[PDB]
């Protein structure tokens, strides 16, 4: 009757299942046919209810603390890993469901938790498995995995940044985004990309190097949410902001932006009630207005100067800085008029 008996049972249960799978793997010996060494199936060990209950508990701060004392993150991650590796990208509903519940618990356990983020990223096999799930037929599973990667890419340490890059999570998520149908999924995928696009220049270059990614991201700037939400424009515009430092020095990529009416839409964003949107737009305009006569002229002609002037005295530091910087670029480069 130990106080955390339920939690201990759940964690021991998924751990024992991983042992069972390891035992199967290691029993592949001559004469060990499928009848002597059957491949374990998670239904045989009540795994989906186990992770379901673990997911529910992980929403509570106190339960998370107990879960962390019992090594819950590692246990849940190893479970997710073994099922992904054993059964691959299956459409089996039981497998999809347990992978979703496990990833939800991992998202909860990584929220604001320095140690857990670093631990999960250090589990390379698990990280590779997470990234592979982005190609699942299940967009709901994609959504969950992107949620995990989102948390791992916030305040990532040096090892974690390197790992996230080495498992190819940036290109995987960008390619995933091009294929998503559901808003819920896109939201989570873009949130993760938003954080990852900030890690280093190489990550920005990887996003830009995905065929169709830039046009797609400019597309998100005018997304029409079926819910009453601005999340897609915020995160899409956020990625564009981060990546625009590289685009600024790339003529071909500027041209893709022009083809998709990027500057004009960014100006419309300056009128947004969302500070995040205005702020992202200011940053993007700052980069795009830099050292480019063509886009400078375009912005003048669109009346960007008076719009930016309206923002320089903003209480919001990013907005005030970005607007002033972009305005400076335009003011220093007045067309013949």
């Amino acid at each position: 009757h130990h106080h955390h008996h339920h939690m201990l049972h759940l964690l021991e249960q998924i751990r024992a299942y991983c042992e069972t799978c390891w035992e199967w793997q290691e029993a592949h010996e001559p004469g060990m046919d499928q009848d002597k060494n059957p491949m374990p199936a998670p239904v045989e060990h009540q795994i989906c209810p186990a992770v379901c209950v673990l997911m529910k508990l992980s929403f509570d701060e106190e339960h998370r603390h107990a879960m962390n004392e019992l090594g819950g993150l590692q246990a849940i991650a190893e479970l997710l890993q073994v099922d992904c590796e054993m059964y691959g990208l299956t459409n089996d509903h039981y497998s999809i469901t347990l992978r979703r519940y496990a990833g939800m618990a991992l998202t909860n356990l990584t929220f604001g938790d320095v140690a857990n983020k670093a631990t999960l990223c250090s589990m390379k096999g698990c990280m590779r498995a997470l990234v592979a799930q982005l190609k699942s037929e299940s967009e709901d599973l994609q959504q969950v995995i992107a949620s995990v990667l989102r948390n791992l890419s916030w305040r990532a340490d040096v090892n974690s940044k390197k790992t996230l890059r080495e498992v190819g999570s940036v290109k995987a998520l960008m390619e995933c985004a091009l294929e998503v149908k559901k808003e819920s999924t896109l939201k989570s995928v873009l949130s993760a990309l938003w954080n990852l696009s900030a890690h280093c220049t190489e990550n920005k270059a990887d996003i830009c190097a995905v065929d169709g990614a830039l046009a797609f991201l400019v597309g998100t700037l005018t997304y029409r949410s079926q819910t009453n939400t601005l999340a897609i424009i915020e995160s899409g515009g956020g990625i564009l902001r981060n990546v625009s430092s590289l685009i600024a020095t790339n003529e071909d990529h500027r041209q893709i932006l022009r083809e998709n009416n990027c500057l004009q839409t960014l100006l419309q964003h300056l009128k947004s009630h969302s500070l995040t949107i205005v702020s992202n737009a200011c940053g993007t305009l700052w980069n795009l207005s830099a050292r480019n006569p063509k886009d400078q002229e375009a912005l003048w002609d669109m009346g960007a100067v008076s719009m930016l002037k309206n923002l320089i005295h903003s209480k919001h530091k990013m907005i005030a800085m970005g607007s002033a910087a972009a305005l400076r670029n335009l003011m220093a480069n007045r067309p013949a008029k």
Partner: peptide, 13 residues
């Protein structure tokens, strides 16, 4: 400019 971020969160659908 400084890069911006989405931050992190508890799971939401």
């Amino acid at each position: 400019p400084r890069d911006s971020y989405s931050g992190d969160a508890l799971y939401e659908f």
